[PDB]
Structures are given as C-alpha cells and as structure tokens.
Ligand binder design. Structure first.
Ligand SMILES: O=C(c1ccc(O)c(C(=O)n2cc3ccccc3c2)c1)n1cc2ccccc2c1
Ligand SMILES: O=C(c1ccc(O)c(C(=O)n2cc3ccccc3c2)c1)n1cc2ccccc2c1
Length: 454
C-alpha cells in the first residue's frame, strides 16, 4: 500500500475566529436548508480541484528549472470516525486564500466548498502553499457563520480536506461506495489517484491532447472503449476549439453499417467538463440525426452541478453540428470513394435530419452532404447539390431531379428524354426516401428543387 494521509498536523496556539461574508453565509444557509438527491457529487468536485492544484504546481516547477516532487491525489475513508479525506501534493493555498477566497472561486463558484457542506457536519482543512518558506494552516468550519484559522505544524505542501460526514451521509465513509463514485465520474483524472493506499485504475483522456499527437492505435483503443465496439472507426474528428466555447472532443463513425440498434439509440456521446463526467448519455449533445456518432465532448464551460436543456447546451450542439458537417464535406474531397460508401451506409440519417429540421438554413447545411447521380455524369458517379449548381447554365434557375429505382429507368423517362434536348442537368435519385427529403428541403442556395415528374 502507498498512503500519505495521517494525522501529522498539530496546532501550537489558539485559533482565530472569523465570520463568513454575508453572501457566502447566504449560500451556506441554502445548503443547510436544501434537499439534495445527488450528494455523491462532492467527490468529483474535490478530485477536480486537487487535479487543478497539481497542474498549477507542475506547470510552475517546469517553467522554472526545478525538480518535480511526487504529484498525487489520495482519498481515505474511515468508517469508525465517519470521515472521508482527500489530500493532494499540489500548490496548496496561502493563509490569505483560506481566509478570503473560500466560497467564491471559479473553476472554468465554490466548487468543492458548498458540496462539502452538503455532506458534512464539519470540515477540517490543512493547507500549505508550495511557495518557499510557506507556513501550514488549519481551517475549520461547521458551515454556520463562523470559521477558524490557526497556524499548524506538520502540514505537508498541498491541501488535505477531512469531511466529518453527516448522520445520513455515512455511506461515503465506506471504501466500496467511494470507489464506485470515483469510477463513475472521475475515471479520467490525469494525476495518480489512490484510495486507502491502493492505486485506482484510471484512464487516459486523449481528447485533451493536441490532435496531431494522438496516433491511430490510440484512437482505435479509445473508440472501442467509448462505443463498446469491436470494429475500428472509419472516420475520426478530433475537434479542439477555444472560441466561442471551450471544446475538446473526439467523434467517430463506425466501420460497420448502422444496425437497428444505432437507429433506435436512447448515450451516443459522453459529456465531460475538464475530465469530470457530466452525462454518460447525451441529451442532445449532438442533433438527433447525428446519433450515429460515437465519442466524447468535453467543455469546461459546462458547470459541475446541473440538472440541461440550457442555452449553453444549445450553443454547443449548434457549433458541433456545423463542425461535423464541415468535417464530412472535407472528407468527401479528401477521398470521394470512401465518402460515397459512408453516404450509402449513413445517408438515411442525413435525410432524416433534413426532414425533421425546423430551420431552412440547417436543412440546407445538412443537404450539402447529399450525393446523387446525374444525367451529366457517368453512371455510378455522384455529385453534390453545390456541384450541380456550379454547372447550371445561364437562364435556368432551378435544380431538377427525378426519383426512379435505377439509372436505366431514369434515363428512359419520357420527361427526361425530352429535357435532354436543351442541356438541362437532372439529378437521378434512387433511394426510396429521396422524394420526401427533396420535398422538405424545397430549395438549395436559393434555387428551387423541381421534380421532373409529378
Ligand atoms: O476542493 C477543494 C480543494 C481541493 C484540493 C485542493 O488542492 C485545493 C487547493 O488547495 N487548490 C485548488 C486549486 C485550484 C486551482 C489553483 C490553485 C488551487 C489550490 C482545494 N476545497 C478546499 C476547501 C477548503 C475549505 C472549504 C472547502 C474546500 C474545498
Ligand atoms: O396537371 C398535372 C400534370 C399534367 C401533365 C404533366 O406532364 C404534369 C407533369 O408531371 N409535368 C409537366 C411538365 C412540363 C414541363 C416539364 C416537366 C413536366 C412534368 C403534371 N397534374 C399532375 C398531378 C399529380 C398529382 C395530382 C394532381 C396532378 C395534376
């Protein structure tokens, strides 16, 4: 076993009593009076803060020329004392930060603070800043208007938080319960995590890496994990952006064709906020028509305690829809043959998306993915609507199409045969849902879609 948590700290003198500012007292009073059904979330908040403190220290030490100490997160349960403790060897807090900041700090407020009092009769904290010459401090509070601070000896650099659990929260002093909570929400924490001296099995959050650094074998492993799949991904989009929102995401299209299970999926993409799980499922992380996509979306703009269907989620969904459409357009130009197979396999999702979309601009965006045969191209070759539009002859302002079972029947339509005399291109559409798709699309790039047979 590898444990660092023990009672090394002592206080030589008396504590100083301070009162919380009224607004922090306000939020603490809300916590004491409220009914929370998801009390386990304090653990993921504490682990996230510990990770942030370790990253702050590591980046600072590497920026200087300094050796790196042991950088770890430890949890300890004590059923006899009814406690759960977290300790990390990160940057710690100064006395000023303990006195003034607690309750009002952002994560990108008070993460780990209000949620600790949700489960605690009282909280006992030791912290010592990593800055040279820093002294250790003890901070104590029962979550009422008062907290205490005192200089403490025997404090290790970093922070230790001891939660003396409430009567109805003793489940968090059981190792097995805590282990399951960690695995559920905190499995991708990026520093070593130990529970009661045992290293926890955690996973690598490859979505946080620079896209150019992730190799195909790593994507294949991660795809198989997140999709619970045995094939390989036919497409991979690793999308990282800082504007208008923070996004670190990986999207995969399966090699296999869609089955009845992918069409009826309840859970397509997992949602994280800086490596803290928010939902294994995805309400509408992506549009419904993109439910065939597997993978992960991480946005630190997502706050840690939620319930969704917010403006933030809607904005994220719209950004991701545009980026995925752009990706598929880019893939069609990189490898048209592979894209044609993707459209054959997954194109009913695009047609669905056009039919169900509310906004004309979204319909036309999705329609950029459609590929059809054309009277003007060799049998079997596909064209896009924009390529058709680029070939339109002066004086002809509509996009003409014909739905038929196959190319032979299309070419022998008496309507098409007559039109051929005047050079007008006609799209040939062989999928049974093409009629509805193009009826709903109605127009593309301000050009009306006209079926050459009524
Ligand atoms: O959740 C925490 C917490 C946990 C682990 C930590 O390591 C720190 C810390 O020392 N940090 C975190 C940082 C993140 C970014 C930069 C520096 C940082 C220093 C803070 N609470 C501490 C409490 C103290 C009192 C009450 C509730 C509390 C909850
Ligand atoms: O009155 C018609 C009608 C009559 C003759 C037609 O030839 C067409 C047609 O399909 N065209 C005409 C074209 C002229 C130029 C180019 C292409 C063209 C395709 C349509 N209805 C069809 C109905 C179908 C259902 C219900 C009422 C309907 C009435």
């Amino acid at each position: 076993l590898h444990s660092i948590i023990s009672s090394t700290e002592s206080v030589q003198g008396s504590t100083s009593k301070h009162e919380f500012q009224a607004e922090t007292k306000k939020l603490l009073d809300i916590v004491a009076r409220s009914l929370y059904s998801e009390k386990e979330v304090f653990i993921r908040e504490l682990i996230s803060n510990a990770s942030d403190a370790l990253e702050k220290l590591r980046h600072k030490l590497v920026s200087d020329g300094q050796a790196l100490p042991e950088m770890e997160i430890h949890l300890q349960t004590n059923a006899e004392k009814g406690t759960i403790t977290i300790q990390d060897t990160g940057i710690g807090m100064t006395q000023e930060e303990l006195v003034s900041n607690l309750g009002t700090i952002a994560r990108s407020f008070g993460v780990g603070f209000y949620s600790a009092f949700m489960v605690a009769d009282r909280v006992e904290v030791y912290s010592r800043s990593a800055a040279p010459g820093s002294l250790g401090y003890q901070w104590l509070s029962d979550g009422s208007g008062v907290f205490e601070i005192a200089e403490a000896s025997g404090v290790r650099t970093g922070t230790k938080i001891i939660i003396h659990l409430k009567s109805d929260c003793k489940e968090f002093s059981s190792e097995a319960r805590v282990r399951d909570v960690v695995t559920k929400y905190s499995n991708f924490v990026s520093f070593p995590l130990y529970l009661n001296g045992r290293r926890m099995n955690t996973l690598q959050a490859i979505w946080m890496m620079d896209p150019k650094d992730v190799r195909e074998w790593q994507h294949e492993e991660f795809y198989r994990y997140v999709a619970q799949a045995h094939d390989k991904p036919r497409y991979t989009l690793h999308y990282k952006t800082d504007a208008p929102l923070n996004i670190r995401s990986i999207f995969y299209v399966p090699d296999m064709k869609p089955s009845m299970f992918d069409v009826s999926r309840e859970s397509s993409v997992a949602l994280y906020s800086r490596k803290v799980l928010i939902q294994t499922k995805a309400t509408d992380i992506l549009p419904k028509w993109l439910r065939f996509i597997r993978g992960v979306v991480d946005s630190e703009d997502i706050p840690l305690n939620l319930s969704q269907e917010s403006a933030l989620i809607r904005k994220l969904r719209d950004v991701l829809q545009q980026r995925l459409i752009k990706f598929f357009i880019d893939q069609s130009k990189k490898d048209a043959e592979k894209y044609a197979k993707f459209f054959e396999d997954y194109g009913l999702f695009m047609r669905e998306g056009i039919v169900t979309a509310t906004e004309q601009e979204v319909k036309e965006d999705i329609a950029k993915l459609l590929r059809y045969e054309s009277s003007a191209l060799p049998s079997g070759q596909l064209t896009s609507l924009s390529e058709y539009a680029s070939r339109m002859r002066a004086g002809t302002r509509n996009i003409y199409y014909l739905c038929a079972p196959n190319r032979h029947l299309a070419e022998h339509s008496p309507y098409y045969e007559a039109m051929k005399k005047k050079d007008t291109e006609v799209l040939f559409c062989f999928e049974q849902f093409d009629e509805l798709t193009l009826l709903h699309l109605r127009e593309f790039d301000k050009k009306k879609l006209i079926s050459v047979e009524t």
